[PDB]
Every structure is written in C-alpha cells, then in structure tokens.
Amino acid sequence: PDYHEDIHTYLREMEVKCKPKVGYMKKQPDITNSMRAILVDWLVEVGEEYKLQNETLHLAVNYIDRFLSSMSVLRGKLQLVGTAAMLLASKFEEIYPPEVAEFVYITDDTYTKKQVLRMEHLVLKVLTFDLAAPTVNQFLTQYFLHQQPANCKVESLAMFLGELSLIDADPYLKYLPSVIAGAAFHLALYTVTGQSWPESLIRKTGYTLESLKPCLMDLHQTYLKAPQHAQQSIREKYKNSKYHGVSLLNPPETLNL
Amino acid sequence: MENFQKVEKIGEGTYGVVYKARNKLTGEVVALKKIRLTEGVPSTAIREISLLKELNHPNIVKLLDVIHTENKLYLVFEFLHQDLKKFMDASALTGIPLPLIKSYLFQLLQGLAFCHSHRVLHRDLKPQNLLINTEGAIKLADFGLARAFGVPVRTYTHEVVTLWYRAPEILLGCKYYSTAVDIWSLGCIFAEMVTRRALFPGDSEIDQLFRIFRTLGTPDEVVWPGVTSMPDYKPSFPKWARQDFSKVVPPLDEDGRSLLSQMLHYDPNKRISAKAALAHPFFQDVTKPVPHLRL
Ligand SMILES: COc1cc(Nc2ncc3c(C)nc(-c4ccccc4)n3n2)cc(OC)c1OC
C-alpha cells in the first residue's frame, strides 16, 4: 500500500541506468537484429516449455541486450549468451529454478555444462551482478493497480503487446521499459474496454497520452503485423485460454490519437 | 583475495560459512562470506549481492565487495560485533532497557522501510539476522532469502522462513508474499525484547498457527475478510478469544501496546507499514542508547 509510489519513482530511476546502448547491433559485426529475434523467440518457447514466469523471460532479454552492448559475440556463441542469461534470470526470479543440466539439454547439446557455467560467470562479470533490472512487465503490473476496475483481458493483452516488444530490437530499444508499458497498457485498454490512458496514471508517471504517441504508433504497427511476423512463439503462447486468447483479438485499424 | 587474513569463524548462515577477517593493507575489519564452487552461482548469493548492491542504508549491513575467482566466491561485508539473539541471551537476567528496545525497533523499522520502498522483501527477520554494535546501532543482515517484488512474489509450497516469526497469512497458505510479513516478524521480535521470551514458539506449522490464535484470538470474517476461503484454513479450527495485551506484554505502556497490535494486525492489507510505524506516538522521545555487550 504505502511503498507503491516510492517503488514507481525508484523503478523509474533504475531503468535509465540498466538501459542498453540504443544502436548496439551496428557495432556487432557478426550478428544482426534478425538473429536476436530468433533467439528471443526461442527463449519464449524455453519459457513456456519449463513453465517459467514471464518476468524471467523479460530479465533474460535485459541481460542479453546489456551483455551484447559491451561484448562482441560471434553468431555461433549468441545462444550460449542467451542460455546463460535465462539461467541467471531463472535463478534471480523463479522459486525453484531449472537445473543447469536442463539448460544444457534444450540447446540440442550445442554447448557442454562447463560451457554454460563459464558463460554464466562471464555474464555476471559483465553485468557486475546488477541483475535486479526493471522490466516492461514490472511496470505493467504496477500500472494495473489503476484499472477501474481490473480486467484480465485488458491485462492479458497488455502483457502480450509488451512481450512482442522483446522480439524486435528495432525499434524497441529507443524506448524505456516504462514507456513501452505505457503504450501497451493504453493500447490494451483501448482495444478491450475502449478507454484511454487514465488520468491518475498521467499524474503518477508524468507521461501525457500525447507523449506516448511515438511509442504507440510503433507498437500498434507490431500488433497489426503480428500475424505475418517471422517469429510466432508469442502469438501461440497468448492464444491460450489462460491468457484469454488475446492474440486472436483484432487490433483497431486506427488509434485515432 | 590475497589481501585478507582470515581471523576466525563467526557462524554459518544460509549462503555459507562466515569469517571475521582483516584487510592486511587498509586495516579495515570485515566479515567474509565464503562460497565453495557446481550448479553455478547459488541462487541465494545471486539474489543477496544483486539486491544489497542497491540497498545502501545505515541500518542495512553494507556489502563492501564481491571477489570473483576461479573456484571460490567471496562476499565482503562490514563487520558488526554480535547478533541480537546473543545479546538477548546475555540480557536474560538483567533485561534490555525499554529505551534501547525503542531505539532498536526504531532503527530496524527504518531499515525495513528502506528495503520496502526499494521493492525488496527480507522474508527472514529473526534475532540472529539482526546485528548490533557497541555504539547502539542495529542493522538488517542475511539477504539470502530476500526477493525483489517489482512483480508480486509467489509463495513456496515448502516454506523456508523461521517458524516462530512467520506471519499467519503464510501459514494459512495465501498465494503471494507481502511487505506485511516483514512487519509481523519485527512485531514478534519487539514483543520478545520486551518479555525475554518468544511470543509464538511453535513446534509444528499447526502449533505455530494455534499459538497465534490463542493470544490474538481466532480470526474470522469480521476481523480478516477472506480468512475462511484460504487454502489451509479449516472450519474445525478452535475458536479462541483475543487476550488482554497488558497480560501479553506487561512492561509496555499504552503506546507500546498500540504499535504492537498494529504490527500484529491479522489482515496483511491493514497491518501497519514500516513507514507508518515510524510516525507512531511511541517513537516521539526515541534516543540512541548504548548497549552493554559481553565477551
Ligand atoms: C552472529 O554472531 C556474531 C556476529 C559477528 N559479526 C558479523 N558481522 C557481519 C556479519 C554479516 C554480514 N553476516 C554475519 C553472520 C555470520 C554468521 C551467521 C549469520 C550472520 N555477520 N556477523 C561477530 C561475532 O563475533 C564477534 C558473532 O558472534 C557473537
């Protein structure tokens, strides 16, 4: 109850610091946005396979993007980075995290157990143990406390949209987690109930509906093009009855902002 | 790592063995937390380092350094003189003066308030996790079971908190942890400082629960809405009456009893927050007395 407003202010400050270099992929000579998408999409499958929290997936990406912001990685080792990030994210976030042997397994035995653990050690070094990173998901759940009243279809849609942002480094690195979350939450609230970014949240976040526009225009695009996108794990994930089959909901043709 | 000379062992705890050590070069006396190194870096350690690096406060024990090597992981901590549990034992005959109890609770509440408004749950507050010095300070320690609650934290099916200091919500099987669980713990410790005896010393999970019921009265829908719908609630629960707090914590004044019942409020939604507790009439004349530490 009382700590909430402080946690928003603190999380808002923390996302500026735990932010990856915007155009880091152009400084990565062997990999491209495409390959990152494939990896992130694979991690969603990994996530659904081992029934891990969505927050674990979010963290794992944050770690990956930060690690790749300061370490040149050849394509053949990108997955080893991804697998280590997931293991670390699982360790930070999951109550009972999956055994290392399990993570070694899902790579089709590309890497050995030693290779994954030595990588984990290196990811920790590069991130300097700063793993308590703030996610789009963290902001979404905080934003949800402002629905009048709560709606799970609204929530499930926002989550889906916010999850979809993880796959495409272009353009979503341009936006802080809190901004993506604001866009996702408004778009979900608009598709489902027809309402808009609420007055109470404008006051809390400082973001006017106007300011979220550049992000909304991009997100709405991903949503509209989502069925044709090369990566499908997320749409599959969210057509489940658990998430109210929201990935099957038709996006509005114009946001009319 | 070749800078530190190990002085002596000072106890095991969650992550692993802990040593008092000295910095051969600066002279600084530290607490070394050693970890042997194969399932990777232990979950508890990853969480402890990660979260403590953020929590810089006078009433939270400072993580000074993390030394990353080949086969060993060392966590360097500021050094304090003993744990509250040991100080309580030394006080057994004489008792901890009420001013010092007030001072300790005030400080702990500041530490906890800092933790919570930085989305960190401690989850394991017990007198052997609280550390004191000769200068009258008290600090939160062992963040091995600590958790970040940017998203709500799901509860373990096999719970790994202490039994005696566990909140009733957890025992009745609610889905998520809460800031309120940390407040409950301090409440139990607060009463224990006052009475020289543990407030609810349970054998088993159900013994713990009933001990909370015998003292504070069996909760119902009027007191705590949704109590009976919780997973581990049983209709056949014995219905005890609430007991006069002046017979539970006799040496406490009206303010002391006022805060304590708010700290032990049944509903976790209406239990006093650390932040609010600091502004309670009880701490209006708080000072910072010095303890007398043995050995
Ligand atoms: C716990 O009892 C004593 C503590 C300390 N000091 C101290 N300072 C810092 C510290 C940290 C970060 N973690 C621990 C710890 C150790 C073991 C079990 C749980 C926690 N400690 N202990 C020193 C003693 O002797 C001087 C004690 O024995 C009386």
Side-chain angles (χ1 to χ4, degrees), chain A residues 1 4-95 97-147 149-202 204-257, chain B residues 1-4 6-11 13-14 16-35 37-70 72-153 155 157 161-196 198-294:
Chain A
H4 278 114
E5 205 213 302
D6 288 357
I7 294 157
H8 177 61
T9 304
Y10 182 66
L11 284 182
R12 268 288 285 270
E13 172 204 333
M14 281 308 295
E15 52 163 9
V16 160
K17 309 175 185 199
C18 292
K19 207 210 174 195
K21 305 271 187 155
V22 186
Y24 85 83
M25 199 56 65
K26 289 160 194 197
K27 303 198 168 200
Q28 281 276 12
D30 205 43
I31 61 177
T32 62
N33 290 330
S34 167
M35 324 190 79
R36 186 196 162 278
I38 296 163
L39 179 70
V40 183
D41 182 84
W42 172 70
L43 289 173
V44 177
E45 277 182 312
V46 169
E48 281 282 296
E49 170 74 31
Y50 288 86
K51 256 146 195 187
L52 307 165
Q53 309 305 305
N54 299 314
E55 169 73 348
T56 305
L57 171 84
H58 270 101
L59 286 156
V61 173
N62 164 283
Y63 303 153
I64 284 155
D65 287 316
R66 280 162 51 181
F67 180 89
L68 289 185
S69 279
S70 56
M71 298 283 279
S72 293
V73 181
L74 295 190
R75 69 187 80 186
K77 300 283 182 284
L78 175 63
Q79 189 163 241
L80 184 61
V81 173
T83 308
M86 204 69 178
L87 173 64
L88 274 169
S90 297
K91 283 174 173 195
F92 181 83
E93 183 63 35
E94 297 296 312
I95 324 157
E99 294 161 288
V100 175
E102 299 271 11
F103 279 98
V104 177
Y105 181 78
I106 43 143
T107 64
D108 276 272
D109 280 31
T110 305
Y111 318 102
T112 59
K113 192 209 174 190
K114 197 180 180 179
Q115 275 184 297
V116 181
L117 290 177
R118 285 174 105 174
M119 179 54 86
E120 179 203 56
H121 212 78
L122 175 62
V123 177
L124 276 176
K125 190 200 226 272
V126 175
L127 301 182
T128 55
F129 284 92
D130 307 324
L131 299 200
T135 66
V136 186
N137 200 69
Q138 266 175 82
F139 277 105
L140 276 180
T141 52
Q142 289 265 287
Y143 290 160
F144 289 155
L145 317 185
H146 288 241
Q147 296 174 69
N151 190 311
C152 319
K153 204 169 284 163
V154 166
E155 290 187 47
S156 286
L157 185 52
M159 296 279 265
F160 169 60
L161 296 170
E163 206 137 308
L164 285 162
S165 73
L166 301 174
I167 309 291
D168 316 318
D170 192 352
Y172 293 116
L173 291 170
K174 282 215 307 279
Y175 305 108
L176 294 157
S178 66
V179 175
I180 301 160
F185 184 65
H186 167 81
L187 188 49
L189 199 56
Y190 188 71
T191 306
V192 177
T193 61
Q195 297 167 130
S196 282
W197 184 242
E199 186 54 44
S200 67
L201 276 177
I202 283 176
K204 197 187 193 170
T205 63
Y207 305 157
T208 60
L209 180 45
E210 181 69 55
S211 59
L212 288 170
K213 190 182 182 182
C215 195
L216 268 162
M217 301 283 89
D218 289 356
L219 193 54
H220 184 218
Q221 283 309 119
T222 302
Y223 186 11
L224 280 160
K225 282 166 177 173
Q228 291 83 30
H229 195 257
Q231 277 60 41
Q232 287 293 306
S233 298
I234 308 189
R235 281 191 73 253
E236 300 296 339
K237 178 173 190 172
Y238 283 86
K239 67 175 69 165
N240 191 217
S241 54
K242 166 178 62 190
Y243 304 108
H244 300 82
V246 290
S247 74
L248 302 170
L249 286 189
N250 272 326
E253 92 176 330
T254 51
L255 297 198
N256 188 61
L257 291 168
Chain B
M1 193 34 67
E2 313 202 353
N3 282 327
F4 301 94
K6 295 174 184 185
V7 159
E8 57 182 58
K9 288 158 204 174
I10 53 170
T14 300
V17 187
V18 181
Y19 294 80
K20 179 194 183 203
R22 198 179 308 269
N23 187 318
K24 283 188 285 166
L25 292 175
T26 69
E28 189 186 28
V29 170
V30 297
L32 274 184
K33 206 162 197 173
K34 188 199 165 183
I35 288 160
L37 236 61
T38 57
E39 263 275 335
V41 183
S43 286
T44 68
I46 289 165
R47 267 186 269 99
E48 192 189 359
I49 302 161
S50 206
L51 298 168
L52 279 172
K53 282 197 82 188
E54 295 191 348
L55 298 165
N56 197 23
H57 192 272
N59 295 113
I60 300 170
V61 176
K62 295 189 197 197
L63 175 69
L64 298 174
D65 202 11
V66 177
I67 289 144
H68 210 47
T69 60
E70 182 53 72
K72 283 164 189 170
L73 186 62
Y74 289 90
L75 323 193
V76 186
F77 281 101
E78 72 153 304
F79 178 77
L80 280 94
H81 305 118
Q82 66 190 230
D83 59 278
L84 182 62
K85 156 77 177 170
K86 203 202 178 179
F87 174 63
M88 273 164 145
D89 286 3
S91 293
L93 174 73
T94 190
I96 307 176
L98 306 155
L100 190 61
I101 293 164
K102 197 176 289 165
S103 188
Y104 282 168
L105 184 63
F106 186 70
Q107 291 178 55
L108 291 169
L109 275 165
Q110 265 159 320
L112 204 65
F114 193 89
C115 280
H116 293 163
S117 49
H118 282 89
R119 52 79 217 249
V120 170
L121 275 176
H122 188 279
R123 306 213 290 107
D124 199 34
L125 298 171
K126 56 189 179 179
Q128 47 277 11
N129 273 335
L130 310 177
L131 302 173
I132 50 164
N133 61 33
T134 51
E135 284 55 56
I138 192 160
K139 309 186 178 209
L140 316 179
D142 196 296
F143 280 71
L145 299 174
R147 279 277 174 193
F149 62 93
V151 304
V153 181
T155 50
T157 36
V161 190
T162 300
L163 201 38
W164 290 7
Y165 304 101
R166 203 177 299 168
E169 322 103 73
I170 302 156
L171 296 160
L172 293 155
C174 62
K175 190 171 179 176
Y176 303 107
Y177 285 112
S178 160
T179 36
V181 317
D182 275 346
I183 289 305
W184 182 268
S185 285
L186 283 190
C188 298
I189 298 163
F190 176 36
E192 193 171 317
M193 289 198 283
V194 174
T195 59
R196 300 177 190 182
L199 188 50
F200 315 112
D203 288 349
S204 60
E205 306 218 318
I206 193 82
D207 185 51
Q208 185 63 22
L209 199 56
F210 287 176
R211 282 174 185 268
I212 302 168
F213 291 175
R214 265 190 302 258
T215 298
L216 305 160
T218 308
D220 52 356
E221 290 294 327
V222 180
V223 169
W224 179 10
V227 130
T228 60
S229 305
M230 289 192 288
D232 290 328
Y233 184 89
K234 277 156 177 165
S236 60
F237 272 156
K239 275 182 163 182
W240 286 291
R242 182 178 177 82
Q243 271 165 177
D244 196 342
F245 254 51
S246 35
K247 285 162 193 170
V248 178
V249 279
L252 275 181
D253 65 324
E254 194 210 289
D255 295 337
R257 295 197 297 266
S258 181
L259 182 72
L260 187 62
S261 77
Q262 291 189 66
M263 289 185 83
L264 300 189
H265 195 79
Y266 263 110
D267 199 324
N269 277 124
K270 303 298 183 177
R271 195 173 297 150
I272 196 165
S273 71
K275 207 185 179 199
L278 284 157
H280 193 263
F282 185 66
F283 299 115
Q284 68 146 306
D285 61 349
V286 64
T287 53
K288 200 201 184 188
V290 153
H292 158 71
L293 313 183
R294 268 221 170 221

Short mmCIF file of all heavy atoms in Angstrom, two decimals, chain B residues 239-266:
data_model
loop_
_atom_site.label_atom_id
_atom_site.label_comp_id
_atom_site.label_asym_id
_atom_site.label_seq_id
_atom_site.Cartn_x
_atom_site.Cartn_y
_atom_site.Cartn_z
N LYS B 239 -11.97 -21.98 18.27
CA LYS B 239 -12.22 -20.54 18.32
C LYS B 239 -11.90 -19.91 19.67
O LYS B 239 -12.72 -19.90 20.59
CB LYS B 239 -13.65 -20.22 17.87
CG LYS B 239 -13.77 -20.08 16.36
CD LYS B 239 -15.18 -19.71 15.94
CE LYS B 239 -15.19 -19.19 14.52
NZ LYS B 239 -16.57 -18.78 14.12
N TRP B 240 -10.67 -19.40 19.77
CA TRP B 240 -10.18 -18.74 20.97
C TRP B 240 -10.54 -17.26 20.99
O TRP B 240 -10.72 -16.64 19.93
CB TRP B 240 -8.66 -18.89 21.08
CG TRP B 240 -8.21 -20.25 21.48
CD1 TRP B 240 -8.37 -20.84 22.70
CD2 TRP B 240 -7.49 -21.20 20.67
NE1 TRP B 240 -7.80 -22.10 22.70
CE2 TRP B 240 -7.26 -22.34 21.47
CE3 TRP B 240 -7.02 -21.19 19.35
CZ2 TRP B 240 -6.58 -23.47 20.99
CZ3 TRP B 240 -6.35 -22.31 18.87
CH2 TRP B 240 -6.14 -23.43 19.69
N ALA B 241 -10.65 -16.70 22.19
CA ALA B 241 -10.88 -15.28 22.36
C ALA B 241 -9.55 -14.54 22.38
O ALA B 241 -8.53 -15.10 22.81
CB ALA B 241 -11.65 -15.02 23.64
N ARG B 242 -9.55 -13.30 21.92
CA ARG B 242 -8.37 -12.43 21.97
C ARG B 242 -8.02 -12.11 23.42
O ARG B 242 -8.91 -11.94 24.26
CB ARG B 242 -8.62 -11.15 21.17
CG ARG B 242 -7.43 -10.20 21.12
CD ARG B 242 -7.75 -8.99 20.27
NE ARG B 242 -6.65 -8.03 20.26
CZ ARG B 242 -5.56 -8.12 19.48
NH1 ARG B 242 -5.41 -9.15 18.65
NH2 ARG B 242 -4.63 -7.19 19.55
N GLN B 243 -6.72 -12.02 23.71
CA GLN B 243 -6.26 -11.78 25.07
C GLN B 243 -5.77 -10.36 25.33
O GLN B 243 -5.17 -9.72 24.46
CB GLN B 243 -5.18 -12.79 25.45
CG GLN B 243 -5.77 -14.05 26.06
CD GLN B 243 -4.79 -15.20 26.13
OE1 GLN B 243 -5.12 -16.27 26.65
NE2 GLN B 243 -3.58 -14.99 25.59
N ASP B 244 -6.06 -9.90 26.55
CA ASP B 244 -5.69 -8.58 27.03
C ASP B 244 -4.18 -8.36 26.90
O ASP B 244 -3.39 -9.04 27.55
CB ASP B 244 -6.12 -8.42 28.48
CG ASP B 244 -6.13 -6.98 28.95
OD1 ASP B 244 -5.49 -6.12 28.31
OD2 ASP B 244 -6.79 -6.71 29.98
N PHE B 245 -3.79 -7.41 26.05
CA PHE B 245 -2.38 -7.16 25.73
C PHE B 245 -1.51 -6.81 26.92
O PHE B 245 -0.29 -7.01 26.88
CB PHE B 245 -2.26 -6.08 24.66
CG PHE B 245 -1.88 -6.61 23.31
CD1 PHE B 245 -2.58 -7.66 22.74
CD2 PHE B 245 -0.83 -6.05 22.60
CE1 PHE B 245 -2.23 -8.16 21.49
CE2 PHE B 245 -0.47 -6.53 21.35
CZ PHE B 245 -1.18 -7.59 20.79
N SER B 246 -2.13 -6.29 27.97
CA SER B 246 -1.42 -5.99 29.21
C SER B 246 -1.02 -7.27 29.97
O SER B 246 -0.24 -7.21 30.92
CB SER B 246 -2.24 -5.05 30.09
OG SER B 246 -3.62 -5.32 29.96
N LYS B 247 -1.55 -8.41 29.53
CA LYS B 247 -1.14 -9.72 30.05
C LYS B 247 -0.23 -10.46 29.07
O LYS B 247 0.36 -11.49 29.41
CB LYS B 247 -2.37 -10.57 30.41
CG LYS B 247 -3.07 -10.14 31.70
CD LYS B 247 -4.48 -10.70 31.78
CE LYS B 247 -5.27 -10.02 32.89
NZ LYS B 247 -6.71 -10.38 32.83
N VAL B 248 -0.11 -9.94 27.85
CA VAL B 248 0.78 -10.50 26.83
C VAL B 248 2.16 -9.83 26.91
O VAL B 248 3.18 -10.51 27.02
CB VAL B 248 0.18 -10.35 25.41
CG1 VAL B 248 1.13 -10.90 24.36
CG2 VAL B 248 -1.17 -11.07 25.33
N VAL B 249 2.16 -8.50 26.87
CA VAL B 249 3.38 -7.69 27.06
C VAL B 249 3.23 -6.70 28.23
O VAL B 249 3.03 -5.50 28.01
CB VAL B 249 3.78 -6.93 25.76
CG1 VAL B 249 4.53 -7.86 24.83
CG2 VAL B 249 2.56 -6.32 25.07
N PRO B 250 3.31 -7.21 29.48
CA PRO B 250 3.07 -6.38 30.69
C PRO B 250 3.90 -5.08 30.82
O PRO B 250 3.32 -4.04 31.14
CB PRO B 250 3.38 -7.35 31.85
CG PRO B 250 3.19 -8.70 31.28
CD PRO B 250 3.64 -8.60 29.84
N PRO B 251 5.23 -5.13 30.57
CA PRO B 251 6.03 -3.93 30.82
C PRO B 251 5.86 -2.78 29.81
O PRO B 251 6.43 -1.71 30.02
CB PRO B 251 7.48 -4.45 30.79
CG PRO B 251 7.37 -5.95 30.77
CD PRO B 251 6.09 -6.23 30.09
N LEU B 252 5.09 -3.01 28.74
CA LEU B 252 4.85 -1.98 27.72
C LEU B 252 3.74 -1.02 28.12
O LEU B 252 2.74 -1.42 28.71
CB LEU B 252 4.49 -2.61 26.37
CG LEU B 252 5.60 -3.06 25.42
CD1 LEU B 252 5.00 -3.63 24.15
CD2 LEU B 252 6.55 -1.92 25.10
N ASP B 253 3.94 0.25 27.79
CA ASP B 253 2.93 1.28 28.03
C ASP B 253 1.87 1.25 26.93
O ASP B 253 1.96 0.44 26.00
CB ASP B 253 3.58 2.68 28.14
CG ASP B 253 4.21 3.13 26.83
OD1 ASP B 253 4.78 2.29 26.09
OD2 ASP B 253 4.16 4.35 26.54
N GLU B 254 0.88 2.13 27.04
CA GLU B 254 -0.24 2.18 26.09
C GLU B 254 0.22 2.31 24.63
O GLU B 254 -0.30 1.62 23.75
CB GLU B 254 -1.20 3.30 26.45
CG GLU B 254 -2.53 3.20 25.72
CD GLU B 254 -3.17 4.56 25.47
OE1 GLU B 254 -3.64 5.19 26.45
OE2 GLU B 254 -3.21 4.98 24.29
N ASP B 255 1.18 3.21 24.39
CA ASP B 255 1.75 3.40 23.05
C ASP B 255 2.40 2.13 22.53
O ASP B 255 2.20 1.75 21.37
CB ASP B 255 2.77 4.54 23.06
CG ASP B 255 2.15 5.88 23.36
OD1 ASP B 255 0.93 6.03 23.14
OD2 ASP B 255 2.88 6.78 23.81
N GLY B 256 3.19 1.48 23.39
CA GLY B 256 3.88 0.24 23.05
C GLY B 256 2.91 -0.85 22.62
O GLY B 256 3.14 -1.54 21.63
N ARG B 257 1.83 -0.98 23.38
CA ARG B 257 0.77 -1.94 23.07
C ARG B 257 0.02 -1.53 21.80
O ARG B 257 -0.41 -2.39 21.02
CB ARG B 257 -0.20 -2.09 24.24
CG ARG B 257 0.41 -2.69 25.50
CD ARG B 257 -0.65 -3.20 26.45
NE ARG B 257 -1.52 -2.13 26.95
CZ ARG B 257 -1.33 -1.48 28.09
NH1 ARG B 257 -0.29 -1.76 28.87
NH2 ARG B 257 -2.18 -0.52 28.45
N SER B 258 -0.13 -0.22 21.60
CA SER B 258 -0.82 0.32 20.43
C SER B 258 -0.09 -0.06 19.16
O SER B 258 -0.70 -0.56 18.21
CB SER B 258 -0.97 1.84 20.52
OG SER B 258 -1.67 2.34 19.40
N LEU B 259 1.22 0.17 19.14
CA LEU B 259 2.04 -0.18 17.99
C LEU B 259 2.08 -1.69 17.76
O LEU B 259 1.94 -2.15 16.63
CB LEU B 259 3.46 0.38 18.13
CG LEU B 259 4.43 0.13 16.97
CD1 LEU B 259 4.09 0.97 15.74
CD2 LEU B 259 5.85 0.39 17.41
N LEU B 260 2.25 -2.45 18.85
CA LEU B 260 2.40 -3.90 18.75
C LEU B 260 1.21 -4.62 18.12
O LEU B 260 1.39 -5.54 17.32
CB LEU B 260 2.74 -4.52 20.11
CG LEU B 260 3.09 -6.02 20.07
CD1 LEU B 260 4.33 -6.28 19.22
CD2 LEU B 260 3.28 -6.56 21.46
N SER B 261 0.00 -4.19 18.47
CA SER B 261 -1.21 -4.79 17.91
C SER B 261 -1.38 -4.40 16.44
O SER B 261 -1.90 -5.18 15.63
CB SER B 261 -2.45 -4.43 18.73
OG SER B 261 -2.88 -3.11 18.45
N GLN B 262 -0.93 -3.20 16.09
CA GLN B 262 -0.92 -2.75 14.71
C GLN B 262 0.11 -3.53 13.89
O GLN B 262 -0.12 -3.83 12.73
CB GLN B 262 -0.65 -1.25 14.62
CG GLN B 262 -1.79 -0.40 15.13
CD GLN B 262 -1.59 1.07 14.82
OE1 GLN B 262 -1.58 1.48 13.66
NE2 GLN B 262 -1.43 1.87 15.87
N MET B 263 1.25 -3.84 14.51
CA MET B 263 2.27 -4.67 13.86
C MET B 263 1.83 -6.13 13.74
O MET B 263 2.25 -6.83 12.82
CB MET B 263 3.60 -4.60 14.62
CG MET B 263 4.33 -3.27 14.50
SD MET B 263 5.94 -3.32 15.29
CE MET B 263 6.92 -4.04 13.99
N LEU B 264 0.99 -6.59 14.67
CA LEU B 264 0.46 -7.95 14.63
C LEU B 264 -1.00 -7.99 14.15
O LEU B 264 -1.73 -8.93 14.46
CB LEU B 264 0.58 -8.63 15.99
CG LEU B 264 1.96 -8.81 16.62
CD1 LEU B 264 1.83 -9.70 17.84
CD2 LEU B 264 2.96 -9.41 15.64
N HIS B 265 -1.41 -6.98 13.40
CA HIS B 265 -2.74 -6.95 12.82
C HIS B 265 -2.95 -8.16 11.89
O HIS B 265 -2.06 -8.50 11.11
CB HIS B 265 -2.95 -5.63 12.07
CG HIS B 265 -4.39 -5.35 11.75
ND1 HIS B 265 -5.27 -4.85 12.69
CD2 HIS B 265 -5.09 -5.49 10.61
CE1 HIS B 265 -6.46 -4.70 12.13
NE2 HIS B 265 -6.38 -5.08 10.87
N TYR B 266 -4.11 -8.81 11.99
CA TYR B 266 -4.37 -10.05 11.24
C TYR B 266 -4.35 -9.90 9.74
O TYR B 266 -3.62 -10.61 9.05
CB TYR B 266 -5.68 -10.71 11.68
CG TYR B 266 -5.47 -11.81 12.69
CD1 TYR B 266 -5.88 -11.66 14.01
CD2 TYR B 266 -4.84 -13.00 12.32
CE1 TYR B 266 -5.67 -12.66 14.94
CE2 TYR B 266 -4.62 -14.01 13.25
CZ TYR B 266 -5.05 -13.83 14.56
OH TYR B 266 -4.85 -14.83 15.50
#
